[PDB]
RNA sequence: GAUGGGGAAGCUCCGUUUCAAAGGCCUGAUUUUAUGCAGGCCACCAUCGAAAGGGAAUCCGGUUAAGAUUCCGGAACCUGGAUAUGGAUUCUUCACGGUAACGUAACUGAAUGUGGAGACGUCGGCGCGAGCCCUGGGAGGAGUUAUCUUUUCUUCUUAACA
RNA sequence: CUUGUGACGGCCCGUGAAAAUCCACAGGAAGGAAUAGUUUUCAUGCCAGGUCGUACUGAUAACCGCAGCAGGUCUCCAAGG
RNA sequence: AGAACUGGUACGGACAAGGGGAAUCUGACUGUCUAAUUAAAACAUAGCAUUGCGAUGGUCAGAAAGUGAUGUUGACGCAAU
């Protein structure tokens, strides 16, 4: 329910010691009339709120999923 | 244009209640709805809120007065008498 | 009366109209005399005497309200206070 | 004659320090580029000293005499000049136009004016200036 | 016969006054040490319309001299009182409109209103809109004052009773004709259930002394002696005279 | 042209039972009740709606931080700013007048 | 409508702050120990009375033979209570900036007092919002087609909360 | 069109509830730091949220009129021409 | 708003939708009542007039009361016609 725009804050937020699960949503969006790109959403289920991080870059998305802690349950959908 | 000859504000009562009664009701409502000078702010902004309550739109002052006018003649006579008694008793 | 002296001030000298203008002038020390209408808010009156006393300025109280003072200076609106910056050709500063 | 001089005590009527005694340190009648209006460089007190009686001994006196000063640019329209006065010599140098525009010299000027205020208040000088305006 | 209407009011079933919207009982400030030894100052805050009352109310705020509180009083507003006006009450108060000077310390010919009949009962006399009391003279020994009530009767009351200077605001109210059963309906809707009134002569004889007959007529004399019992007092009670008043009252 | 119904058991169009028809992600029209509108706080002296303060129902003020309920001036969340200015002016002037009156009184008593 | 009271032979009646000795509230002190002494404070002075008045806080999708704002899934909020970390602030002890209206992530505060909200009529017109109605383009589906009809109907939606 | 809302204006011898409850301010009692504190109106974190109603009709058949009676019974939403 | 053209003079084409005038009696008017035979010229009403009362009071209630209604009232009021 709360959006996060800082990657450092997000990666820190993945180590809050209360979060157990997260999900990664892939969307197909259009930047303008010609070019469709792939939207990726990072949602971390906090104890009290849901934090969503949105990335419009595929490369950054790959680097970030690579950088998630292994102890966190990730869902692909 | 001039809409009525004599009824004026009491045209809303139509042909009923009798001529004379409508006459003095007009005579009083004209005073009731009129605008009065602010004794404090000096403007034509004093209106009647309720019976006897006269307040000024600007300067936010309210003065207790007559039910149908800002002040009656008896009030003026009383105020003058009080002033006479004050300047008689202090000197 | 005194209104003729005021009129000659207006036609000859310089002056200000209004509370903000007069307090600004009195703050700068350019005011020689101030005139207060009868029904001026007494708190405003009192701060005016305090300012004048701080500025060593003569004070006169108009025997009339805002409307009478405004007509005295020859204006179609009401004036609560006037400040005299220069007499020009008048005599109010010497008398009263 | 103009009266807003470099030693007059005034009262702030508007702003965060409304009702606080201030002393004019540096006047500016014809405004400035940063402030196109008649403004000053007053120094005041935010937390007035508490009342002290015979009963308090040797530390409650010290705690109850603490002074929190402040320095600000204020429009002349937001001051009431007083007939009182309080000379400024020990901290007229530190308070200046360039004393502001960065936080540091503000705070070490506040320190000097705090020292000057508490020194005067320790002696029997300017009780009215240190007395809180009740309203 | 049946119990007549005027008897039926005393039970107070539906005949009690409608007191929802009234702002409170309009009483003077209680008579304490300050008033009988000096004067006290007050501030007029609100001038409020009172439901079921022609005169407006004056809501004056006082200071409690014994405890740090803000006693608030409800006065009847005199004509000429304004919000923010300072009000002085006490023996040593200055004789000004809205002040509450005791009748002992006020010269003859003064106008007062809301006058106490005994000291400390917080105002009885002359409490209606446009009404006032004349002070005629004093009796310094065995302190005593003679005053003129709105009824025209002369009454002698104690010199320590209080009364506010001025005339009750709202005068001339009864001058405007109502023109409408609706206007009277709304007027009495906030006072009590006493309207409309049915003529006794148009009643059956079981309902009223006047009722009955093949023509609407009272039959007997309509002037009822004061020695009559409840249920007979229907008409002109203890009428000294009757008929149109031609000439001076000679009071 | 769907027609909605009250979502609660009070069928009377009272103040506490106002509704606002809204469209849901399900594509249907569903009535939703709206709470009574908040009234702005008012100044103690000038009687006007003093600004800078959040406007909520009275109980809901217990939930928000101190910042939303006050201003950083004396009489912050209580009195109008112009009211504060005029009362400061009144206080100063009347106190100075009190000193003036006492010096005049001691002068006149010393004269006789 | 109890109580203190006052009537009535009595069933009971009056009265709801009245001719009353009409109480609990916080801090602490003592750490035989539990709570009395240490204090201070305060003066309404029972209770009942509204499923349409006032009122702390929830929405969406799905599910049953019959329940759903109650169940399931997801996402919030309020009250009460404990609390730990981060943040904030302090050597000028209890923050700063803006001339000002005022702003922020915070940014001590008891007794007592003041103020605000709760909290408010009806009617006429005007502005603004939401929903509905109308309609264009486009992407699907259905109907009529002896003849005509870029045609007729229909789906294109986004809650509380931040 | 329905409805909500704002600024208004008209009307009154009618000026059109109260309480619970929450907050702010004034006040400065008290408590407070430097080798360390103070702070839970800032963020995050932990636990709990008791009791009763919840189906259905609400009317030319589920209510009252002896009844499966052309009677009576409060209210919400209201498409096109 | 106007102008041509057109039709078995039709055209607010269904629906929807005031008859009018001259007078007399009576009530001024809006309003209310005999649920289930009488809605009126009856009642009420605004206006007018009269009476009582300054509270240790007027009118009225209770068996009594340290009891009540008017009365959160005070003659521009309350009460009775
Ligand atoms: Mg009746
Ligand atoms: Mg009959
Ligand atoms: Mg009989
Ligand atoms: Mg008869
Ligand atoms: Mg409710
Ligand atoms: Mg703010
Ligand atoms: Mg805000
Ligand atoms: Mg009882
Ligand atoms: Mg209850
Ligand atoms: Mg309820
Ligand atoms: Mg209500
Ligand atoms: Mg909700
Ligand atoms: Mg169901
Ligand atoms: Mg659930
Ligand atoms: Mg900060
Ligand atoms: Mg309020
Ligand atoms: Mg959205
Ligand atoms: Mg409606
Ligand atoms: Mg209105
Ligand atoms: Mg159910
Ligand atoms: Mg159900
Ligand atoms: Mg149902
Ligand atoms: Mg139904
Ligand atoms: Mg139905
Ligand atoms: Mg049945
Ligand atoms: Mg019949
Ligand atoms: Mg009939
Ligand atoms: Mg009749
Ligand atoms: Mg009586
Ligand atoms: Zn005014």
UniProtKB/Swiss-Prot annotation, chain C:
The gene is RPL30. Belongs to the eukaryotic ribosomal protein eL30 family. It comes from Saccharomyces cerevisiae (strain ATCC 204508 / S288c). PANTHER family: RIBOSOMAL PROTEIN L30. Its main location: cytoplasm. GO terms for biological process: cytoplasmic translation; negative regulation of mRNA splicing, via spliceosome; rRNA processing. GO terms for cellular component: cytoplasm; cytosol; cytosolic large ribosomal subunit. It is found in: Cytoplasm. Keywords: Cytoplasm, Isopeptide bond, Ribonucleoprotein, Ribosomal protein, Ubl conjugation. InterPro entries: Ribosomal_eL30-like, Ribosomal_eL30-like_sf, Ribosomal_eL30_CS, Ribosomal_eL8/eL30/eS12/Gad45. There is a cross-link at residues 14, 45, 75 (Glycyl lysine isopeptide (Lys-Gly) (interchain with G-Cter in ubiquitin)). NCBIfam families: PRK01018.1. This is Large ribosomal subunit protein eL30. Present with 59300 molecules/cell in log phase SD medium. Disulfide bonds: none annotated. SUPFAM superfamilies: L30e-like. One of its GO terms (molecular function) is pre-mRNA 5'-splice site binding. The keyword Repeat does not apply.
Swiss-Prot record, chain D:
It comes from the Eukaryota. This is Large ribosomal subunit protein eL27A. Disulfide bonds: none annotated. InterPro entries: Ribosomal_eL27, Ribosomal_eL27_CS, Ribosomal_eL27_KOW, Ribosomal_eL27_sf, Translation_prot_SH3-like_sf. GO terms for biological process: cytoplasmic translation. The gene is RPL27A. GO terms for cellular component: cytosol; cytosolic large ribosomal subunit. SUPFAM superfamilies: Translation proteins SH3-like domain. Component of the large ribosomal subunit (LSU). Mature yeast ribosomes consist of a small (40S) and a large (60S) subunit. The 40S small subunit contains 1 molecule of ribosomal RNA (18S rRNA) and 33 different proteins (encoded by 57 genes). The large 60S subunit contains 3 rRNA molecules (25S, 5.8S and 5S rRNA) and 46 different proteins (encoded by 81 genes). The keyword Ribosomal protein applies. Keywords: Cytoplasm, Ribonucleoprotein, Ribosomal protein. Pfam families: Ribosomal_L27e. The lineage of its organism: Eukaryota, Fungi, Dikarya, Ascomycota, Saccharomycotina.
From Swiss-Prot, chain E:
The modification Phosphoserine is found at residues 51, 94, 158-159, 248. There is a cross-link at residues 45, 92, 118, 144 (Glycyl lysine isopeptide (Lys-Gly) (interchain with G-Cter in ubiquitin)). Its main location: cytoplasm. GO terms for biological process: cytoplasmic translation; maintenance of translational fidelity; ribosomal large subunit biogenesis. Keywords: Cytoplasm, Isopeptide bond, Phosphoprotein, Ribonucleoprotein, Ribosomal protein, RNA-binding, rRNA-binding, Ubl conjugation. InterPro entries: NA-bd_OB-fold, Rib_uL2_dom2, Ribosomal_uL2, Ribosomal_uL2_C, Ribosomal_uL2_CS, Ribosomal_uL2_dom3, Ribosomal_uL2_RNA-bd_dom, Translation_prot_SH3-like_sf. It comes from the Eukaryota. One of its GO terms (cellular component) is cytosol. The keyword Metal-binding does not apply. PANTHER family: LARGE RIBOSOMAL SUBUNIT PROTEIN UL2 (PTHR13691:SF16), RIBOSOMAL PROTEIN L2 (PTHR13691). Belongs to the universal ribosomal protein uL2 family. Component of the large ribosomal subunit (LSU). Mature yeast ribosomes consist of a small (40S) and a large (60S) subunit. The 40S small subunit contains 1 molecule of ribosomal RNA (18S rRNA) and 33 different proteins (encoded by 57 genes). The large 60S subunit contains 3 rRNA molecules (25S, 5.8S and 5S rRNA) and 46 different proteins (encoded by 81 genes). There are 2 genes for uL2 in yeast. This is Large ribosomal subunit protein uL2A. It comes from Saccharomyces cerevisiae (strain ATCC 204508 / S288c) (Baker's yeast). The gene is RPL2A.
UniProtKB/Swiss-Prot annotation, chain F:
Pfam families: Ribosomal_L34e. One of its GO terms (biological process) is cytoplasmic translation. Keywords: Cytoplasm, Ribonucleoprotein, Ribosomal protein. It is found in: Cytoplasm. Disulfide bonds: none annotated. GO terms for cellular component: cytosol; cytosolic large ribosomal subunit; preribosome, large subunit precursor. Component of the ribosome, a large ribonucleoprotein complex responsible for the synthesis of proteins in the cell. The small ribosomal subunit (SSU) binds messenger RNAs (mRNAs) and translates the encoded message by selecting cognate aminoacyl-transfer RNA (tRNA) molecules. The large subunit (LSU) contains the ribosomal catalytic site termed the peptidyl transferase center (PTC), which catalyzes the formation of peptide bonds, thereby polymerizing the amino acids delivered by tRNAs into a polypeptide chain. Present with 23600 molecules/cell in log phase SD medium. This is Large ribosomal subunit protein eL34A. It comes from Saccharomyces cerevisiae (strain ATCC 204508 / S288c) (Baker's yeast).
